[PDB]
Design a protein around this ligand. Structure first.
Ligand SMILES: Cc1cncc(CC(=O)N2CCc3cc(Cl)c(Cl)cc3C2)c1
Ligand SMILES: Cc1cncc(CC(=O)N2CCc3cc(Cl)c(Cl)cc3C2)c1
Ligand SMILES: [Br-]
Ligand SMILES: [Br-]
Ligand SMILES: [Cl-]
Ligand SMILES: [Cl-]
Ligand SMILES: [Cl-]
Ligand SMILES: [Cl-]
Ligand code: NA
Lengths: 302, 306
């Protein structure tokens, strides 16, 4: 029993973190085989950030301009290139701790663990979701750029941290250097757009609450997908698709509660509130557990 | 910016997890140097649980009645002993991935990371606190016994908890790594239950300080309080008394924000009286009590967003 925000074990990722310095900037890099990946904005001075020509700025750098440190060992850079917004530094030593891995781009609503790092040293691990507005509500300070997000499916790397937006939420890229969301690595006015609640995840968490014995919000009613979606739109919740109904299938089978029966519970909670009650100890409807996160935690997958 | 439940990176502990089997029971062990530590209830059957005599159950076992598996390798047990409620199995191979470590017994209110494991393999990592009633609100299933809790502040792993059982209310009980239970719990199937719990006041105050560091002050007010009047109020909401030692540990957060500890106590008294009026604090609609003052200093910026 119990239900917590749970991250994946981080050991396989810890052994990949290094420190990358270019000029006066120090941030984190990811060392896999003989390549170190980090944000390409490490090559910019503050003035370069206003209107950077990354191709020209990178042409002006030499391999020597990048200092890479793995613990107390200097790794010699022998080549440099960019892929989208990620800098790739070829080094003279392959990481002997490289795990089996893939680079995976995730979709909004999906969760991942973040290994927050500073000076190439792992500091902490927490769980996040990619919001519908393509930001993440992380916990990061100056020096955290290059920290990564991942799932274990093989380590699937899905996020590299690049910047904090004015509301204090975060923006970054996949490990192929493609930003999540309409954000750029240039100093210009950027902002998080209006966000919405991840409906399929709230339904997954209501299933977690039922598995854990919390059933007060169940009722005799059902709804249709059309009627439910009209309510979701009114309350700033993402539309529920038939694919979301199918992904909730395993949790619906384990509890015996049809997805449209659970939608009638969620419709009533949105229209009436909780009446002073809590669900899994929360007074808010939680949306950062996917259906797979609930199955992983309630079944003890290792 | 941001504020999350933040666990320690778990790799140093992952490299210590093994599977221990005795008879038909399999659970987790912690392999440090040439010793594997695990709950001594691994030597009980279900029937033995009502009134076990662990000395009589253990004397019947040889070293080869214990199987220890580290990954796909069998470790050979060459000695065994019991220290309080922990069984220690001496093995023929030392763990080459043993980190720098120590064993510490913690007090209620302290936090730690838990690495939940099944069959000697890690499942996930989350933060927990030792509640005032000496239980932890973990997330554990059958087979999780022997999973451990720890901190890694200065590159040294401080192990503070080993999981032994789930209580009737769904909360968890266990021991330190010397085998002494937290609280009055025993490794025998009795009518023991979690006592009424209270809220960890010093931690709520630390989290309000985190909210101010991160830029929000809506919940402050023009009042102060004496420590005794604060305690008389707090206890009426089932909050733990605040001591002068707790006031001292909040000192650095008070200095960084310019808010006196007793003035933050006045704010907490008013939040308990008023609620949040539809607002949240650090994304929460309820008051959070599982971040210590040390956890806030570890995670927050050292510069307040004024
Ligand atoms: C507190 C914090 C948390 N996470 C990360 C940072 C760093 C940050 O937000 N920076 C520095 C790097 C950078 C680079 C580019 Cl190209 C642009 Cl457009 C913006 C920024 C702004 C700070
Ligand atoms: C769901 C769950 C989570 N965490 C752990 C368990 C196991 C559990 O709660 N058990 C089995 C072992 C055991 C040993 C003794 Cl000596 C006593 Cl008194 C009771 C129990 C009950 C189950
Ligand atoms: Br109906
Ligand atoms: Br909440
Ligand atoms: Cl940075
Ligand atoms: Cl969290
Ligand atoms: Cl068990
Ligand atoms: Cl220490
Ligand atoms: Na219903």
């Amino acid at each position: 029993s119990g239900f917590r925000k749970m991250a994946f074990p981080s050991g396989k990722v810890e052994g990949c973190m290094v420190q990358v310095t270019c000029g006066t900037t120090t941030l984190n890099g990811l060392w896999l085989d003989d390549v170190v990946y980090c944000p390409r904005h490490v090559i910019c001075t503050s003035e370069d950030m206003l209107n950077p020509n990354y191709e020209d700025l990178l042409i002006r750098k030499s391999n020597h301009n990048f200092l890479v440190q793995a613990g107390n060992v200097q790794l010699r850079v022998i080549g440099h290139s960019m892929q989208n917004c990620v800098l790739k530094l070829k080094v003279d030593t392959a990481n002997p701790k490289t795990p089996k891995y893939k680079f995976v781009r995730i979709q909004p609503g999906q969760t991942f663990s973040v290994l927050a790092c500073y000076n190439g040293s792992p500091s902490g691990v927490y769980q996040c979701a990619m919001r519908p507005n393509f930001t993440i509500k992380g916990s990061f300070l100056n020096g955290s750029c290059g920290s990564v997000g991942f799932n274990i499916d093989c380590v699937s790397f899905c996020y590299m941290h690049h910047m904090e937006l004015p509301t204090g939420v975060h923006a970054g890229t996949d490990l192929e250097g493609n930003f999540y969301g309409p954000f750029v690595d240039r100093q210009t006015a950027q902002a998080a757009g209006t966000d919405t609640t991840i409906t399929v995840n709230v339904l997954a968490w209501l299933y977690a609450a039922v598995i854990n014995g919390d059933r007060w919000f169940l009722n005799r009613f059902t709804t249709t997908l059309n009627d439910f979606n009209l309510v979701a739109m009114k309350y700033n919740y993402e539309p529920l698709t038939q694919d979301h109904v199918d992904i909730l299938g395993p949790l619906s089978a384990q509890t015996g509660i049809a997805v449209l029966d659970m939608c009638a519970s969620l419709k009533e909670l949105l229209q009436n509130g909780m009446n002073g009650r809590t669900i899994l100890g929360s007074a808010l409807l939680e949306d950062e557990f996917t259906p797979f996160d609930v199955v992983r935690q309630c079944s003890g997958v290792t």
